[PDB]
């Protein structure tokens, strides 16, 4: 989706605005430890601000590589089926897992577990990533407070808005990750029925 390189790219671009004016936003004679309370403000949220970015940055990482998985020994039950007869699972596991006596069947179950193995991967990715965006983006709302027209609070707002729907987007990518390994699922069971039904020709 495209509509995803357009959230990432205002991100980006607005993120580094803030940055920029972060003294500026949070800008410094007996009640002056209050003065302090706001630099400690202005700290705390450049901790929260980077590691949102870090959150986004490794997730777009990912998607580039998992993305080439799906183009190809992800793409179809064929590919998979080939990838693990060159790709075997070690010896115990194709044992307590897979021992059976077709060697066929066993690329087929081989199969199924790297599947399965590839889902318990993307949503751990799924599950890191929403703790972390969670405990970050919570001390985003310093923003509000800091800024000093109305005016400026609605921009920072706004701001924070593109956050969120870039997130949500991002988990909208784990997501279908997950539903495109579980549809190949379902083609690599037709694909071994049909297998068992050409196997009683002979």
Known sequence: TSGLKQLDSTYKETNQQVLKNLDEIFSTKIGKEDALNIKKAAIALRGDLALLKANFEANELFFISEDVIFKTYMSSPELLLTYMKINPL???????????????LVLYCEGKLKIEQEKQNIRERLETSLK?????????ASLITASQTLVESLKNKNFIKGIRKLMLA???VFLNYLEKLDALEISLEQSKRQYLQERQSS
Request: proline share 0%.
């Open 90 to 104: 070690d010896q115990k596991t194709a044992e307590q897992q897979c021992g059976i006596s077709d060697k066929v």
């Open 132 to 140: 972390a965006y969670q405990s970050n983006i919570g001390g985003t």
């Open 170 to 172: 991002h988990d909208k």
